[PDB]
C-alpha cells in the first residue's frame, strides 16, 4: 500500500516536511523536484531531521551534532552517526506524494 502523505506543492525544493503514519514519523524531502522519504528521527540521537535538519541538495544535516545522511539511500555522509536512515518507497500520483510506510528499507 502506498499512502497519501502530502501534496507535491506542499514541499518546495530544498525543503522538508514531517508526516505521521500510525506510530512512525517520516521526513519528506524535495530534492530538485523529486521526493524522498526517510525516517524523521536522526539515528544518532533524539532529534528530528525535518524540523531540526538542513537539506543541502540530496544530503540532510542534523543540527545537533552535524551528522549527515543521503536522503535517497539513507547512507551516512558525515559522522558521528553509525547507522543509515530507514528509507521508504515513493509514488507520485498527480498532486499526491504517496509513501509506502510498511516498506522501510536499510542500505546497510
Ligand X SMILES: OC[C@H]1O[C@H](O[C@H]2O[C@H](CO)[C@@H](O)[C@H](O)[C@H]2O)[C@H](O)[C@@H](O)[C@@H]1O
Kind of pairing between the strands at 96-99 and 90-93: antiparallel
Q: Which does 44 bind (CB under 5 to 8 A by kind): ligand FES, ligand X, none?
A: ligand FES
Q: Which does 54 bind (CB under 5 to 8 A by kind): ligand X, ligand FES, none?
A: none
Is the Cβ–Cβ distance between 78 and 67 less than 8 Å? yes
Report the interface residues with ligand X, using CB under 6 A: 4, 6-7, 10, 17, 19
Which residues between 10 and 69 bind ligand FES (CB under 6 A)?
42, 44-45, 47, 62, 64-65, 67
Q: What share of the chain is helix, strand, coil (3-state, %, to 5)?
A: 5, 50, 45
Amino acid at each position: 500500500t502506498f499512502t497519501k502523505a502530502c501534496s507535491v506543492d506542499e514541499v518546495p525544493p530544498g525543503e522538508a516536511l514531517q508526516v505521521s503514519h500510525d506510530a512512525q514519523k517520516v521526513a519528506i524531502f524535495n530534492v530538485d523536484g523529486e521526493f524522498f522519504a526517510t525516517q524523521d528521527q536522526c539515528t544518532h540521537g533524539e532529534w528530528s531531521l525535518s524540523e531540526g535538519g538542513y537539506l543541502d541538495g540530496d544530503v540532510v544535516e542534523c543540527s545537533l551534532h552535524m551528522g549527515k545522511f543521503c536522503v535517497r539511500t539513507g547512507k551516512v555522509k558525515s559522522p558521528p552517526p553509525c547507522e543509515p536512515l530507514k528509507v521508504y518507497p515513493i509514488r507520485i500520483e498527480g498532486r499526491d506524494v504517496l509513501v509506502d510506510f510498511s516498506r522501510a528499507a536499510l542500505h546497510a
